[PDB]
Symmetry: C3
Subunit: 257 residues, 3 copies
């Protein structure tokens, strides 16, 4: 269900097909008491505040029981129930044996999200500067600039709205045209050639300029492409590595023994 589109005119790639869950609240629960030994160790090691929330601190069934108590839709309950791993990673446990457990509440769910990657475009060079995750919100778009804040599992993304930036939909036009009149796209500029590569979700972007030699290879077939002056995109189905000068980039994870 996940796709990636490449836009040569702006030297940027967009990974689409994700579905959202945006944290807009917290649900708290007070808890009192072999298992006690593990809880005690955790709090001693982390000075009274832990994350993720471990199974010792809260068991798989106790968690589902709390999910059921939460004041939310059934589709929401169902979604959290299938992603306890992420839910735990976005939760906190705080000592006050008494301690308080703190779980996320998702204000909105099943909205489109996409991730944006960018590379230099030269003729002078321009690079778009607003990389990261975007999600549709209440008719606008929430943008999440810090990579830490969004967790992905298959086609589901879970983001924290605490430090998000709200933007109009017209930002999408920057993908096609950097000089568009409806929104002022953020860019960075240079007066000299620059070459590099960026690994994206389903491939890689290669910006190759000036005298630099750039090549792409396959583990079995060796060198399959030599690039010249341009901005190009390569699929992870047909390419395993990219080379920019003497720097080697790996498009796929390299499976070991």
């Amino acid at each position: 269900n996940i796709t990636e589109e490449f836009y040569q005119s702006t030297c940027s790639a967009v990974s689409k097909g994700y579905l959202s869950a945006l944290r807009t609240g917290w649900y708290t629960s007070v808890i009192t008491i072999n298992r006690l030994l593990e809880i005690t160790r955790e709090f001693s090691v982390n000075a009274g505040v832990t994350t993720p929330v471990s199974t010792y601190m809260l068991t798989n069934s106790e968690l589902l029981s709390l999910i059921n108590d939460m004041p939310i839709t059934n589709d929401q309950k169902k979604l959290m129930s299938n992603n306890v791993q992420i839910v735990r990673q976005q939760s906190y446990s705080i000592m006050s044996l008494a301690y308080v457990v703190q779980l996320p509440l998702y204000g909105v769910i099943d909205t489109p999200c996409w991730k944006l990657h960018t590379s230099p475009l030269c003729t002078i060079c321009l690079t778009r500067t607003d990389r990261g995750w975007y999600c549709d919100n209440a008719g606008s778009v929430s943008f999440f600039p810090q990579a830490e804040t969004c967790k992905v599992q298959s086609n589901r993304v879970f983001c924290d709205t605490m430090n998000s930036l709200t933007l109009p939909s017209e930002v999408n036009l920057c993908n096609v045209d950097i000089f568009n009149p409806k929104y002022d796209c953020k860019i960075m500029t240079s007066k000299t050639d620059v070459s590099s590569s960026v690994i994206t979700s389903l491939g890689a972007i290669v910006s190759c300029y000036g005298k630099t030699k750039c090549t792409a290879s396959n583990k079995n077939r060796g060198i399959i492409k030599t690039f010249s002056n341009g901005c190009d995109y390569v699929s992870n189905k047909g390419v395993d590595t990219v080379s920019v000068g003497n720097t080697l980039y790996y498009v796929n994870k390299q499976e070991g023994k």
Copy 2:
């Protein structure tokens, strides 16, 4: 007394009343050991020789107060750290040393606060439309030797009650005139950082003691109470809600929760 002031003219809220402690140094101490040893060994194996926070196994409550007493600082400083060992541990590191022949040696690293008891405030912001503007520099501010230190990454400051503890390592220094941006974005004494839009935008932001709601264009925004129900239907404006009288806010189909929701005990 912690308070929150809302400023409609800039669509921003400021949480005030905090008192500061800014880390400007480190105090180190070498520790040797010939049950507790088992826990220390595990910690270092799991964290590849460097840990934070500093656990009670690595350094006991009384050993810690003893070190706080050794540190070259004021008594009010000593008193402050003594009442906040939890935070102090969270801002400290423990580093394993060489593989000795007959002992386990490691170094413990504790914060030294270069200044204390200065005012801090936290700034939240939401979009203001008339074309829209949003102020950009959210986060913690603290007074510092006649200027203001600004801490843009939320991770860097720890709060407990009315005390804040921040790390000066990656701070930005600014003049006091930055306060004037709260009331007037177009003031002549300082260039307030803003982000702009040519189209309507709607959103909400949860603050410390409430929430801000920016509602523009065709979007429906409402605020509700548990008891009662819908109190307020908003139209085109920037409004603030107190967490004493409102529990939830709705922007289009997105629901925001102003209070933490208390669950089964």
Copy 3:
């Protein structure tokens, strides 16, 4: 081998002499299994994903064995072998499905090595109604296939001795002409990023081998030695101090510590 240059004209300092290793890939390995107890605890505490990769999860020798399997040069293998601590810190371990316990270990592959890196620190510079400027792009820079990779988040780079290990995931690519911003902020070959003020500002910044002190307006700033007390009183300007000769700096009532302060030892 490691030096630091101060540039008064820009109120900035550059630490040089480091050598690079830039992560551009991952090497994965599937693993099946007293030791089992520790592994189980780690996954229960961290909800199935851990970093760093512990000795329980992967032993010192198993690690070197994997380093030997990796498709890379010998100098690379030699470098990682001397820095297992860092390698573990940059690696992940992820549990799978289901005494029959499977998990995947994830190690960095360094696309390039032994290139120069430097770190950039900056402080406010004020002049003339006063105007004041601060350069905004602090952090690590490394040479990379004829250009320069910049790493703005401090988290991403780990240092040990004169070696730096950085993650290219969130890097920004820049031309070499950025170096000219060290000497001249208003240079014509590159547009240096700056932040501005219309009022005086004073502060200090601790660098790798010293500290920078920006002292302006009515503020009093001093520098001291433990063995000699006050050795300098500053006036309106931007100055640098070496950590060999100075231990503390004072800006108004705020005290900064240039060196780590050695304390009392304990025994158990």
